[PDB]
Ligand binder design. Sequence first.
Ligand SMILES: N[C@@H](CCC(=O)N[C@@H](CS)C(=O)NCC(=O)O)C(=O)O
Ligand SMILES: N[C@@H](CCC(=O)N[C@@H](CS)C(=O)NCC(=O)O)C(=O)O
Lengths: 216, 216
Amino acid sequence: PAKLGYWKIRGLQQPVRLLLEYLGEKYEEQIYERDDGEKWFSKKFELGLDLPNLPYYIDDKCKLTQSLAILRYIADKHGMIGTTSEERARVSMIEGAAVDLRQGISRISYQPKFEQLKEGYLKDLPTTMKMWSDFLGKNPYLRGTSVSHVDFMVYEALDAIRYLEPHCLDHFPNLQQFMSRIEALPSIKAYMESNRFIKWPLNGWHAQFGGGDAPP
Amino acid sequence: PAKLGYWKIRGLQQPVRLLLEYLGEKYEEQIYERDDGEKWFSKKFELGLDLPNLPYYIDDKCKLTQSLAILRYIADKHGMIGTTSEERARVSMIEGAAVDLRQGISRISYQPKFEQLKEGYLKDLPTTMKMWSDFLGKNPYLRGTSVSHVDFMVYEALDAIRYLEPHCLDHFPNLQQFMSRIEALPSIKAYMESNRFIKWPLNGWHAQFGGGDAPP
Ligand SMILES: N[C@@H](CCC(=O)N[C@@H](CS)C(=O)NCC(=O)O)C(=O)O
Ligand SMILES: N[C@@H](CCC(=O)N[C@@H](CS)C(=O)NCC(=O)O)C(=O)O
């Protein structure tokens, strides 16, 4: 079983957990609690990682850092990366846009001026959602009929944003169905009902938004 | 010839230009000047791009956005992405860390409080440089004896940081040699001596740092 290391939050690791649960990969999570900073910063350079960071992934074949590299390793091993250069590039494009979507809310949430930034962010949100709604179109998933790691990235990003603006998906029925479709996948549904599931926080505990001890 | 679109700055597009020049790919750059905002937003949704953004890449086979997706497409076509899942993941890990390196300086540079943030950033820089110095080790390039897209990513990131802190590489001779090695590559040296080379600005024109009309 691979060892995964990360804070006890959703943040960057959630899409990886979801993917691991979807393809039935056995893994052990090394959870770092709110007060484990010292614990991490003391072993950070003792784990044998080339470029130390959280999250990290370790198994008999690989030692990795970088949330996207970790997600793509599991996806690669399961044939979800793309078979041609054009396809692999299109996949990377979707990942990049998904990173932008999640990082956008992350940026303003860790900002002391969150309250101020929030208004501008909410003003632009609609255009962003439309772009994604138009991209998904009539497809069940981002790349067609089959689920892949990008779906779990976008799903998590949308779920986090709906915590800030609950009606953000109201005018986009396909995005709403997309969310339900993911939550209805047998392996996902079961994981979300387990005690392994981390529902909160969305961001780091110290965030102006999404960092409480409980949902707002 | 592929068409590349981006602002007339280094920013996110520089590593792509460098790579295109290294493998001899013919391309046409659609440059957006400091006052071309309107020029971009007016047709941004008219270009047929799935997820509109700058930079964008267009050729007879592909239409892409996302700087990393674009860089990886060219790299993929040239066999620099990796042959196994473990190798491709390791490559992605390096890319992610390189993105972190460049985005770190980018973050504080577009921040109005740049002047304040600068001190904290400079305090941590040494640790970051050491991490990269240790990673490169005795290798001529990040992945061994052969240059790849990641080298141009890290090179550009280090060059940008040396503009903020000129002695940041002083205690890391291998990183210094790495920089020289890249600049000594025949295709790179020639490109940097051409009139196609964009030397400044590093960040967007309106950045607190690296956004002037000329170097500081
Ligand atoms: N680009 C990196 C970002 C990693 C990162 O910022 N990790 C944060 C939490 S989300 C951290 O606590 N890192 C620990 C450290 O820097 O030592 C990734 O995608 O993994
Ligand atoms: N994650 C994206 C970021 C793209 C981005 O932020 N582009 C900026 C300039 S660096 C821009 O002007 N985009 C135009 C737009 O959003 O319409 C990437 O790596 O390409």
